Design a protein around this ligand. Structure first.
Ligand SMILES: *[C@@H]1O[C@H](CO)[C@@H](O)[C@H](O)[C@H]1NC(C)=O
Lengths: 49, 50
């Protein structure tokens, strides 16, 4: 699986709602609606099928 | 896709029992018994007493 480092950028997650007709969007530890209000040191995105 | 097919949504908002109740469930009332330790149910308020 491919892991992509995401850093030094502004992440607005509402744009994701135009990217894909989501079947499952579930989060652990953070509510999905407050993700625009927080700051993270580094994000990692793992992509597979 | 699944995330863009339209949906039809009905929201049923209920007002709790703080007044005389106009909307009630399909239940049948019984006779009134006074001056005796009975189990009572007044508009969904359950209890046990005289
Ligand atoms: C994905 O990329 C293609 C071309 O690269 C573009 O036509 C399409 O609009 C993009 N999808 C979204 C959701 O932006």
């Amino acid at each position: 699986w491919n892991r992509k480092r995401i850093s030094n950028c502004v992440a607005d997650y509402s744009v994701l709602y135009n990217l894909a007709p989501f079947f499952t969007f579930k989060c652990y530890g953070v509510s999905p609606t407050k993700l625009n209000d927080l700051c993270f040191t580094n994000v990692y995105a793992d992509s597979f099928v | 896709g699944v995330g863009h097919q339209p949906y039809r949504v009905v929201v049923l908002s209920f007002e709790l029992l703080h007044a005389p109740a106009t909307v009630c469930g399909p239940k049948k009332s019984t006779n009134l018994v006074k001056n005796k330790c009975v189990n009572f149910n007044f508009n969904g308020l359950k209890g046990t007493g005289v």
